[PDB]
Every structure is written in structure tokens, then in C-alpha cells.
Swiss-Prot record, chain C:
Residues 23-119 form the TFIIS central domain. It comes from Saccharomyces cerevisiae (strain ATCC 204508 / S288c). This is Transcription factor BYE1. The chain holds residues 232 to 365 of 594 of the full protein. Belongs to the BYE1 family. Present with 892 molecules/cell in log phase SD medium.
Curated annotation (Swiss-Prot), chain D:
It holds the Pfam family Zn_ribbon_TFIIS. The modification Phosphoserine is found at S39. PANTHER family: DNA-DIRECTED RNA POLYMERASE, DNA-DIRECTED RNA POLYMERASE II SUBUNIT RPB9. Zn(2+) 1 binds at C6, C9, C28, C31. CDD domains: Zn-ribbon_RPB9 (cd10508). It is found in: Nucleus, Nucleolus. The gene is RPB9. One of its GO terms (molecular function) is DNA-directed RNA polymerase activity. Its main location: nucleus. This is DNA-directed RNA polymerase II subunit RPB9.
From Swiss-Prot, chain E:
Mutagenesis experiments demonstrate that the minimum viable CTD contains eight consensus Y-S-P-T-S-P-[A-S-N-G] heptapeptide repeats. Identical and simultaneous substitutions in a number of consecutive repeats are lethal: 'Ser-2' -> 'Ala-2' (14 repeats), 'Ser-5' -> 'Ala-5' (15 repeats), '2-Ser-Pro-Thr-Ser-5'-> '2-Ala-Pro-Thr-Ala-5' (10 repeats), 'Ser-2'-> 'Glu-2' (15 repeats), 'Ser-5' -> 'Glu-5' (12 repeats), '2-Ser-Pro-3' -> '2-Pro-Ser-3' (15 repeats) and 'Tyr-1' -> 'Phe-1' (12 repeats). The binding of ribonucleoside triphosphate to the RNA polymerase II transcribing complex probably involves a two-step mechanism. The initial binding seems to occur at the entry (E) site and involves a magnesium ion temporarily coordinated by three conserved aspartate residues of the two largest RNA Pol II subunits. The ribonucleoside triphosphate is transferred by a rotation to the nucleotide addition (A) site for pairing with the template DNA. The catalytic A site involves three conserved aspartate residues of the RNA Pol II largest subunit which permanently coordinate a second magnesium ion. The lineage of its organism: Eukaryota, Fungi, Dikarya, Ascomycota, Saccharomycotina. Belongs to the RNA polymerase beta' chain family. This is DNA-directed RNA polymerase II subunit RPB1. Coiled coil: none annotated. There is a cross-link at K24 (Glycyl lysine isopeptide (Lys-Gly) (interchain with G-Cter in ubiquitin)).
Swiss-Prot record, chain G:
This is DNA-directed RNA polymerases I, II, and III subunit RPABC1. Keywords: DNA-binding, DNA-directed RNA polymerase, Nucleus, Ribosome biogenesis, Transcription. GO terms for molecular function: DNA binding; DNA-directed RNA polymerase activity. It is found in: Nucleus. GO terms for cellular component: nucleoplasm; nucleus; RNA polymerase I complex; RNA polymerase II, core complex; RNA polymerase III complex. Transmembrane segments: none annotated. GO terms for biological process: nucleolar large rRNA transcription by RNA polymerase I; ribosome biogenesis; RNA-templated transcription; termination of RNA polymerase I transcription; termination of RNA polymerase III transcription; transcription by RNA polymerase I; transcription by RNA polymerase II; transcription by RNA polymerase III.
Length: 147, 56, 119, 119, 56, 158, 215, 49
DNA sequence: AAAGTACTTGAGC
RNA sequence: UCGACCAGGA
DNA sequence: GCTCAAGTACTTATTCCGGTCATT
């Protein structure tokens, strides 16, 4: 209940079954381009790989699913700071309002209000949504590995 | 159906109707028979709009 | 011209196998006899090539690897030294060289696939 | 594969060749870290997979009332009390082989009469 | 006829066993698929067959 | 079938396998990338005999064919079942790979009878690794071993 | 790879037979003895010292039959050329194009292995009234006219066409059409406007004749 | 997350059967997938057993 | 209601 | 008596 | 900057035969 914030989050596995460089990107509301999961994780504060990887793949032994994550680590590699990720999110899709200081502020807005409005819309929760996005990627690769 | 155990490939499980209309169908036999029957009712409804346009 | 040099190396391999494969013949049912017998296949495989007027090099390996094998292919390798055609063995080279254990599986597969694509 | 992370910044380690000593290294591209490789293996494909078959075998597996029971004796404890299922690998091709879980020692055994495994 | 009905009941019964036997064979990885077909696609075809032979 | 050979069961099997499309992907269990620095020797002791027959004599020359190749190895393992089922020689598979990359890839293999079926690959004459993963994709997906393209599952009929 | 030399020669001998079959069917003097030339005899004639097929020597001239002169009096001689180069060069095509002009040939059939230069094929409609035709070797291995489903296509004379339109009271647009590129229209060397009489069996009358105009 | 799911499942199932948890509340435990899903959702179609 | 025409965009090289 | 929706019949 | 794969826009259907609403 609450105007029913109908925001459908899509987490896509780009690249066909056997095609080289299989990356995972996600579409958030009011952002034009599809953002590689690593950048979203970095925008939520989860900065190193294997913290991002730890949120997605729970078992350390499952090498099969982790090799599936190597190209995602390589995609988001360009962004290494939370602000560098927020600026990247802000720049991509509405956006328009050119001046670094503002796109970062309204990138935080998209992640708080529109990205996963169920769970919460409150400021402090980043950790809760980080694990959920991780859970979704886990469910995606589980179907991709035909398990 | 929830009346069966998991990984059951027996005739009873995957929809075989051992009985005759005279002897009468069991609740499971009844549901599966309805499932197949529904398929016929759909086929009839669609292949009228389709087959009709082919005629034109 | 270059051909003779390529043939030279090929003979060296046969005599190496004919020294380390010949040991179980005496164990159940020497370095000089292996040298002569090596030349007996090197010119025999040459008979199979360049007809009237590449493949050869690959025939050398299949002869080496299979005759080496044991303790299943040694029963076939025993026949080779004991009056089994050395002439036929040269133009043999395929699934016929294989182990009696591997030929059991090959026959078990071939006859089983046959009933699947016959529809 | 089983890959490692950079101690210090906890990031993905990428390969790097030590051309001098002909050895493999794993470097961090977020910092100055470098560590020697454990294995010569860096990448593994696996088209024909075996991991996903024994998936979901939790210790609570026996408490699933949906799961069917059998009177098969365990190869270890010999208990005729087990809860079985089919390969949890959700591929079209997959065989109808059964995997049994003992309601005592919780050992996983099969109905597989083609070959013997350890998973 | 009662006798006909006994014959019919044991005709379905025998086909159920024929299926169970093919089920046990496929469970012990002894079944071999009929080209371009899955092992499952092969088992299903022979099961559907035994039951339709039985109904007939 | 040819007017004469209409009941020739053996000529049917022959055309069946001559036309049915067969890719390397269909005959591979797994592919691996190893750092095997000296190309004249091998880190993997399993493959020791592969170098001992194929690499020893010949040579392909003496050695001449540029042994200063690449330290990165592409190791493919083939399924004996699907190999023998689709009627294939290790040499057949090997020569089909060596004809695709012409003289950019030094290819060797284990013999048809050995316990494990292996194809050892190395690139020829700054920056690598990523290109090797691209070469393996071209190998599985593209390279046709036997048969005509577009022709899948061929079946015999009486 | 002695197998690949043996398979390439079969295919070439097969295509040569089809060229012979096509030129005989087009109304040129070729014996059935010429067509049914054995593989042994073919090798003996056109292969070199190494057994490699010399396509240069295969090239031949064909002249119209006595009856062909009656129906088509303007049907001149024809030249067929086979090239040993898999990619037929613009220098090689000029040598061929000029062969037709000096010997005043009516038609020229170029049988190529893999391809012809886009440069070289610009010289095709450059020498009227003579026409040049291009055929890929593999496309000729099997004669498509010999198939079950391919009926007897007959090229009508200008007079024969004139009669068909008179007797059926037709304008050319009322006749069923055949594409210039149609595999059979290519075989017969059909030119736009030419008509074919298609005689086929009928489960209704036993024999039914239809007609198709080239475009 | 939970550490002893069986104990929690028996507790919740007994709570709803007592009436302490609303009888319409759906509660599933997928042992194989290691998950406890609870729906207090409006719109779920149910049947008594 | 999925599949066609007829353009136009991306980019292989 | 302008025509949209819904419900039906063979 | 040229061929060509591929993405885009935008097109197109589906037999015959009372009640209620709002508005014309
Ligand atoms: Zn670091
Ligand atoms: Zn036990």
C-alpha cells in the first residue's frame, strides 16, 4: 500500500549460450542505459570484488558460478569508488542536468526511492538491497548453469 | 498433484486413466481427463479464427 | 631429398619399441634383432605411400602407441613377432590395432548406435 | 579453477608472466600486489558437467514428506531406510538415474548400473 | 462379461508391469536413446506406447 | 540411395555419416588453459608420452617449424564414446584444426587408443591470454569435422 | 591427402559431363559417346604428369546441328572455357572476351572454380550481338534437368512464339512467366522474351503442355 | 537468515494452528533450496485441509 | 498476433 | 436510434 | 568510408446471429 511503486527491475545475462564475454547488466527506473551489477554494488557501498562476489555466490568452492562472474568484475573495473559509481549512474539516463555535483545526488535518489522500493525506501538501507540484488544474480546464474 | 510423491513417472502419476466411463473415474483420473479435455476446447476455439482467415 | 632425413628419424622409433615391448615375450610364452625388424616396417609403410606417382607420419604413431600398450595388446604384439603378417599390419592401421578390452567397448557401442538411427 | 584475491585490497587477481624465470604470477590491478600461482591451470571450460546432480542435499533432507522412500540397503551402514530423488541437473538430455540418501549415516548412493562414482 | 472384465483388468495390469520394468531399466542407466532423442524422450515414447497398446 | 546400392545397408550408414554435420564442440568434454612455458617440454605429467611420440620423431622438419611458439597452452579433452560413435580419428580432428589456423597454431594430439583423448594447442609469432579464449570459441562453435552445414540428426529408413 | 585430389577430379569430370549435356541440349553437335566419356578416359586426356587436372585444355568449341539450323538459322557457334585459376582474373577475362570477337562466336560460356573479379564481369555486356554466360563449377556437378520433378523445357522459335500468341489470342503479359535466372532458363541460355514449352505428365490427362515466357 | 530452520518451522506452524498467526498466512519451507518464504499477502487463493 | 516489408543504424575491416 | 461495452447462441 | 548484419519503425489480421450506459 502506498500509490503502488510499480518499478520492475530487470537483471539480464548479456551474451548467448557459448558466445564470448558474458556480462550481467541491470535496468533501474528512470535510467536509460543498462548498468553492470558491479557498478550498482559499488554505488551501494560494496566496493571490493569478493565482497561483491561474496554477496552473489555464497559457496567459495563453486568455481563454475564464479568464472561466470569474472567478466562482470572486468566490466565494472573502470569504477572503483562509490562516488565514481554514483556519477556513472547519474550520467547514464535522465541525467541531462550537466554539472557533476547534481547527477551524483540524484543517482542516490534513484537507488533509494525507485531501486527495490519493496524492502524499503528509507535512506540508511544499502546493505539489505545489496544482498537482495546478490540473491537475484544468484537465481539468474543458477538457471544459466542449468541447476 | 500433491497426492503423489516427488519424481513419480508411473502411469497413474503422469495421467493414465485405467478405468472406463462405466466404472467411473478417480479424482486424479478426473482432473487429468479435464486437463486434456481443456486442450481440445482451446484448439476448437482458436482453429476457427485461424482456419476462417485461411479460407478468406 | 629432404624425404630421406624424415624417413631416418621414423626408423629410430620402431627399434625403441622393439626393445622395450620384446621383454614380456620371454617373461611369458636382443637389441640387434630389434634394429633389423625396425627397418622391416619402415620400407613396408613406404610401399603403402606414393602409389604410381602426408598420411605416413600418422601411421608411425598408431603402430608405436598400440604395439606398446600391454597387458591386453601384448597378446596381439606376441602374434606380430610370431609369424603374424607384418605386410598386413602396415596397411591395417585403424580400430583393428586397438586393445581386446577397447575392441569389446567399440563393438558394444557400434552395434548399440545401429538400433537407434535405423528408425 | 578455485581462484584467489589480493590481500590488502581484496580484489580479483589477474595472470602475469615472469618471462625471466618462466613462471606464472597473479597480479592485482587495483594495487602493487603479486603472488606466485598455485597451479598451472588458469581456465577450465567443462561442456559435459557433473556438478548439480547431488545439489540440495541438506541434513534436513529426510524431513521432506514430498520425497519418496525406498527399502534399499546403504552401502555403508546397511540401513533399509532412505529418501531418494533424480539428478538435480535440470538439462533436457539428463538420465533418470536415482540418488539415495540414508536416513542414518546420510551417505549418497545410486541405482547407476553403467558406472561407479564418489559424489 | 465378468470374464471379459477380468481379461481387461489383467491386460492393463500386465502393461503397468511392462512400464515399471522399462522404468527400472531406465533408472539403472541401461536404457539407450533412439537417435536425436533424449533418454527421457525415448523412455516416454515406449511408456505412452505400452499404455496405448493396452487401452486398444 | 544410388540406383544400384538401394538395399546396401552399409552404403546408407556411409552417406549418413558423410552428410551429418559434426562440430568439435560435440566431441569435447572440457577445454583448459595452462601456463606451460617451455614448448619443448610439459608441466602436465599425464601428457608426457604425447610429447614423446608426436613431438619427438618427427619434428615436421628438424625442427625448423619455429619452436619459439607461445607459453600458453589450450588443452582439449575428447569423449571416446562420441568420438567412436561419430567415427573419428584423433589425426582427422587434428588435421581439421591445423587446416583452419594454417600456420598460426602448433597442434599435437594423444593417439586414438590412449586412456585420455587430448589435443594440445599453442599460438605462433606483446599482450596475449584474451586472444586464446577467442581461439577456443572459434574451435568449438565454427570448425566442422564431418558433414554438410545445416544438416543435423540424419536417420536411416527402410 | 590423396583423397582430396581424387574427390576434386570426380566433381570436375561430373561438371564437364553436365556442360556437354547442356550444350547438346542447347542444340549443338555433341555425341552421346562424347557425353558418356569415362573417368579413366577423362584423366588420360586432361590430367598432367602429376595427375592434376589441366582445365585450360578442357575448353572446347560446339557447332549447331542440321535440325538446329532449320528452327534457328541465326544460331551461331559457341565457345566454352574452363579456368585453372580458382579466382578468374580481369586479365584472363579480357583474353576470353577477345577470343569470341575475332572468331565471331555467338555465345561464350565461362566455367569458373570459385569466383570472377567484379572488374572482369563488367566486360560481359561489352561485346554485342554476342552474349557471355558464367557458371560455377560446383553448380554444374549435378545436372538439375535430369531430376524427377523437372519437366521437358523446349525453347520455341520466334515463329513458334508468334503462333502460340495467335492461337491462344494472347499478349505476352498473359503468358505464365519464367525468371531469367531460373536454373532451367540458365541451362537453356534463355534470353528475355524467349518462350519455353513445358511438357509434363498429368494424373488427370497423362500429358499436359504449359508455356512460360522469359524475363 | 536462520540457523535451525526445522525448530522455527514447527514453532510457526503450531502458532498458526493455535490462531496466534492468522490462519490465512502462507508459510513454506523449501528444504532443498534452504529457504523460508512467508506471505501475509492479500489475494492468495487457498483451500482447507 | 506473430511475422512480414522496408528502411536505417551500427560497425566489421 | 448516435454506438460503445458487457453478456450469450451455432 | 562500403558491405552487411542487425536494429528499428510500423504495418497487418480473427464466420453468422439482448442488456446497460452516456450521449447523440
Ligand atoms: Zn591489491
Ligand atoms: Zn547409511
Amino acid at each position: 500500500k502506498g500509490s503502488r511503486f510499480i518499478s520492475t527491475l530487470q537483471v539480464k545475462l548479456y551474451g548467448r549460450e557459448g558466445s564470448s564475454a558474458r556480462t550481467i547488466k541491470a535496468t533501474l527506473p528512470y535510467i536509460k542505459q543498462d548498468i553492470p551489477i558491479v557498478i550498482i554494488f559499488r554505488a551501494l557501498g560494496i566496493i571490493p570484488d569478493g565482497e561483491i562476489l561474496e554477496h552473489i555466490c555464497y559457496d567459495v568452492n563453486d568455481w563454475q558460478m564464479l568464472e561466470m562472474l569474472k567478466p562482470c568484475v572486468e566490466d565494472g573495473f573502470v569504477i572503483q569508488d562509490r562516488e565514481t559509481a554514483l556519477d556513472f549512474i547519474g550520467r547514464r539516463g535522465t541525467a541531462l542536468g550537466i554539472k557533476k555535483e547534481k547527477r551524483i545526488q540524484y543517482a542516490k535518489d534513484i537507488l533509494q526511492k525507485e531501486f527495490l522500493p519493496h524492502i524499503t525506501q528509507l535512506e540508511g538501507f544499502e546493505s539489505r538491497k545489496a544482498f537482495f540484488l546478490g540473491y537475484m544474480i544468484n537465481r539468474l546464474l543458477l538457471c544459466a548453469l542449468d541447476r | 498433484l500433491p497426492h503423489f510423491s516427488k519424481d513419480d513417472y508411473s502411469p497413474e502419476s503422469k495421467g493414465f486413466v485405467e478405468n472406463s466411463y462405466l466404472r467411473g473415474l478417480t479424482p486424479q483420473e478426473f482432473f487429468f481427463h479435464a486437463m486434456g479435455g481443456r486442450e481440445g476446447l482451446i484448439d476448437t476455439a482458436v482453429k476457427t479464427a485461424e482456419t476462417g482467415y485461411i479460407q478468406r | 631429398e629432404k624425404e630421406h632425413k624424415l624417413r631416418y628419424n621414423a626408423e629410430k622409433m620402431f627399434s625403441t619399441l622393439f626393445s622395450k615391448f620384446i621383454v614380456p615375450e620371454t617373461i611369458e610364452a636382443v637389441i640387434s634383432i630389434s634394429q633389423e625388424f625396425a627397418h622391416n616396417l619402415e620400407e613396408e609403410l613406404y610401399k603403402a605411400c606414393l602409389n604410381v606417382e602426408k598420411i605416413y607420419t600418422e601411421k608411425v604413431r598408431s603402430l608405436y602407441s598400440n604395439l606398446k600398450d600391454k597387458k591386453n595388446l601384448e597378446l596381439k604384439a606376441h602374434v606380430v613377432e610370431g609369424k603374424l603378417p607384418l605386410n598386413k599390419l602396415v596397411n591395417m592401421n585403424a580400430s583393428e590395432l586397438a586393445n581386446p578390452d577397447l575392441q569389446e567397448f567399440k563393438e558394444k557401442r557400434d552395434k548399440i548406435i545401429l538400433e537407434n538411427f535405423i528408425v | 579453477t578455485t581462484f584467489r584475491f589480493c590481500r590488502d585490497c581484496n580484489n580479483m587477481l589477474y595472470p602475469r608472466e615472469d618471462k625471466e624465470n618462466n613462471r606464472l604470477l597473479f597480479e592485482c590491478r587495483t594495487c602493487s600486489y603479486v603472488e606466485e600461482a598455485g597451479s598451472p591451470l588458469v581456465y577450465r571450460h567443462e561442456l559435459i558437467t557433473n556438478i548439480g546432480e547431488t545439489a540440495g542435499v541438506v541434513q534436513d533432507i529426510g524431513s521432506d514428506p514430498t520425497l519418496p522412500r525406498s527399502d534399499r540397503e546403504c552401502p555403508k551402514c546397511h540401513s533399509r531406510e532412505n529418501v531418494f530423488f533424480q539428478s538435480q541437473q535440470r538439462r533436457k538430455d539428463t538420465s533418470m538415474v536415482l540418488f539415495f540418501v540414508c536416513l542414518s549415516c546420510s551417505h549418497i548412493f545410486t541405482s547407476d548400473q553403467k558406472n561407479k562414482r564418489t559424489q | 462379461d465378468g470374464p471379459t472384465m477380468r481379461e481387461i483388468t489383467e491386460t492393463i495390469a500386465e502393461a503397468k508391469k511392462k512400464v515399471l520394468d522399462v522404468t527400472k531399466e531406465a533408472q539403472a542407466n541401461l536404457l539407450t536413446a533412439k537417435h536425436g532423442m533424449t533418454l527421457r524422450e525415448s523412455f516416454e515414447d515406449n511408456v505412452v506406447r505400452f499404455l496405448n497398446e493396452a487401452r486398444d | 540411395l544410388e540406383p544400384g546400392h538401394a538395399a546396401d545397408q552399409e552404403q546408407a550408414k556411409l552417406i549418413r555419416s558423410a552428410i551429418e554435420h559434426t562440430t568439435l564442440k560435440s566431441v569435447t568434454i572440457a577445454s583448459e588453459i595452462y601456463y606451460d612455458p617451455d614448448p619443448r617440454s610439459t608441466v602436465i605429467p599425464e601428457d608426457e608420452e604425447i610429447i614423446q611420440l608426436h613431438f619427438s620423431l618427427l619434428d615436421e622438419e628438424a625442427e625448423q617449424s619455429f619452436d619459439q611458439q607461445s607459453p600458453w597452452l589450450l588443452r582439449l579433452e575428447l569423449d571416446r564414446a562420441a568420438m567412436n560413435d561419430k567415427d573419428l580419428t584423433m589425426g582427422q580432428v587434428g588435421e581439421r584444426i591445423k587446416q583452419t589456423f594454417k600456420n598460426d597454431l602448433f597442434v599435437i594430439w594423444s593417439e586414438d587408443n590412449d586412456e585420455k583423448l587430448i589435443i594440445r594447442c599453442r599460438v605462433v609469432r606483446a599482450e596475449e591470454d584474451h586472444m586464446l579464449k577467442k581461439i577456443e570459441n572459434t574451435m568449438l562453435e565454427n570448425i566442422t569435422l564431418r558433414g554438410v552445414e545445416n544438416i543435423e540428426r540424419v536417420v536411416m529408413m527402410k | 591427402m590423396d583423397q582430396e585430389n581424387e574427390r576434386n577430379i570426380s566433381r570436375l569430370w561430373r561438371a564437364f559431363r553436365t556442360v556437354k549435356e547442356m550444350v547438346k541440349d542447347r542444340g549443338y553437335f555433341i555425341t552421346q559417346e562424347e557425353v558418356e566419356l569415362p573417368l579413366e578416359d577423362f584423366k588420360a586426356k586432361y590430367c598432367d604428369s602429376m595427375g592434376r587436372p589441366q582445365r585450360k585444355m578442357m575448353s572446347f568449341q560446339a557447332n549447331p546441328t542440321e535440325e538446329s539450323i532449320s528452327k534457328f538459322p541465326d544460331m551461331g557457334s559457341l565457345w566454352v572455357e574452363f579456368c585453372d585459376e580458382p579466382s578468374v582474373g580481369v586479365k584472363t577475362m579480357k583474353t576470353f572476351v577477345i577470343h569470341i570477337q575475332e572468331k565471331n562466336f555467338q555465345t561464350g560460356i565461362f566455367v569458373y572454380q570459385n569466383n570472377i573479379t567484379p572488374s572482369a564481369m563488367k566486360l560481359v555486356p561489352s561485346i554485342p550481338p554476342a552474349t557471355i554466360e558464367t557458371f560455377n563449377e560446383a553448380a554444374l556437378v549435378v545436372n538439375i534437368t535430369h531430376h524427377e520433378l523437372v519437366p521437358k523445357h523446349i525453347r520455341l522459335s520466334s515463329d513458334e512464339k508468334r503462333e502460340l500468341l495467335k492461337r491462344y489470342r494472347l499478349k505476352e503479359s498473359q503468358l505464365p512467366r519464367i525468371q531469367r535466372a531460373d536454373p532451367v532458363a540458365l541451362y537453356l541460355g534463355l534470353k528475355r522474351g524467349e518462350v519455353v514449352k513445358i511438357i509434363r505428365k498429368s494424373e488427370t490427362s497423362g500429358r499436359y503442355a504449359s508455356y512460360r515466357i522469359c524475363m | 537468515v536462520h540457523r535451525n530452520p526445522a525448530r522455527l518451522m514447527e514453532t510457526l506452524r503450531t502458532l498458526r494452528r493455535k490462531g496466534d498467526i492468522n490462519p490465512e498466512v502462507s508459510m513454506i519451507r523449501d528444504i532443498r533450496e534452504k529457504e523460508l518464504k512467508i506471505f501475509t499477502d492479500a489475494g492468495r487463493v487457498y483451500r482447507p485441509l
